[model samples]
Target: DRPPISSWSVDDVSNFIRELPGCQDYVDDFIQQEIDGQALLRLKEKHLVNAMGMKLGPALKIVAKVESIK
Candidate 1:
């Protein structure tokens, strides 16, 4: 079974995001907010940009990858 995204803490998200291309600099920016990774998985494209401050392309990929979790 796959671990739920909620298992990921702020530090976990930061470390994972840092490994993503183009997301390294944004790692620190995300931890400042109180976002959960589970919430992130459900974000629509527009919401990712407007609400989460993520660029569209990167957000799409993140969503795709996260959605594939078991």
Candidate 2:
């Protein structure tokens, strides 16, 4: 089974958003509409920017991180 976001350590989760630019804005979204590894693997840049209100460049950057994991 795919790992849940909750499966990560607090430090790990904290680090995930901490490293990305403009990612502070997306943290609240994680609580309200939590998504996990598999979901992140499938997400598109447009959804991060357009759907989730992240910047295209930063979204792509973070999306690249997510893509890198799996």
Candidate 3:
């Protein structure tokens, strides 16, 4: 069975943005949109890592590094 999935809401993103420096310009709409788009990317990365792990077995570790492009 697949692991329980946790949904990251816009509120989560907004809260994170609020804690960031120089993010005063980030409004609710912008944060929501960004989070929506990022959800898809995260899912894809998770799948890729899962498939790799199956092939390489538990001996190898996969770490995903995310960085802000801006």
Candidate 4:
């Protein structure tokens, strides 16, 4: 009965990512991109760096956390 990652809304995605260490600075960017869980699955370092202009360090961590969620 738990919500699947794909079902997560923008706000849900925001809170999850917000909790990731060092991800605080880019939380708004995730909101700006409307990165709901579905999009979050599709996220890659390329998107974080090239699309959102996030640094490699935090982007790597985000990708790792996303992987853990899956």
Candidate 5:
């Protein structure tokens, strides 16, 4: 059996990152990184979001919120 697919939207994911207090800078950095090199892969938004959240820890709150916006 395959893993269940994530239904989260880019906007929703961004929003979650944006909501994290004190994580604005980190989230912004991640966005800029992606913009600079197109880090987002096809159908991998959820993985990126989850990875960022894990690596970023508390910083993920803001990142998640920002993701939702875009």
Candidate 6:
């Protein structure tokens, strides 16, 4: 159930983004895309900014969060 962040499930990824400051808004979209731990790691700035339509600030923040776990 409580595995490492790298092996986290979709629910786990959702919970993580929910806890990040100003990132809760994208939790649903994250789930919609089925972004699990591995997928999360592969997210690029373009994906967040252009694809997800997230602001540059939040996009970088999310990328930073992903980097932290790596």
Task: Please give, for residues 2-39, the per-residue lDDT of candidate 3 as tens digits.
Answer: 12123445565456445544443444533545553245
The residue ranges of model 3 lying beyond 4 angstroms of the native Cα positions read 1-6, 31-70
Error of 5 at 29 (Å): 5.3
Candidate 6 per-residue lDDT, tens place, 1-70, comes to: 3467678999989998999899889999999999998898899999999999998888899999778767
Give candidate 1's whole-model lDDT.
0.70
lDDT of 5 by residue, 6-56 (tens): 444444334434656654445564554442212322324354456544344
What's the lDDT for all of these models?
A: 0.70, 0.65, 0.37, 0.88, 0.42, 0.88
- Put down candidate 2 lDDT per residue, 1-44, tens digits, no spaces: 33555366444544577667767767667545556544555679
- For candidate 4, what is the TM-score? 0.91
Which of 5 and 6 is the better model by lDDT?
6
Residue 4 lDDT in model 2? 59
Which one wins by TM-score: 1 or 5? 1
Question: What's the best-to-worst order under TM-score?
Answer: 4, 6, 1, 2, 3, 5
* True-structure Cα RMSD, model 1: 2.4
Query: Which pairs clash in model 3?
Result: none
Q: Give the per-residue Cα lDDT of candidate 4 at 53.
A: 97
Using TM-score as the measure, the top candidate is 4
**Which segments of model 4 are wrong by more than 4 Å?**
none
Instruction: Report the poorest 10 consecutive residues by lDDT, candidate 5.
Output: 35-44
The per-prediction CA RMSD against the true structure, in angstroms, equals: 2.4, 4.5, 12.8, 1.6, 9.7, 1.9
lDDT of 4 at 43: 92
Candidate 6 stretches greater than 4 Å from native: none
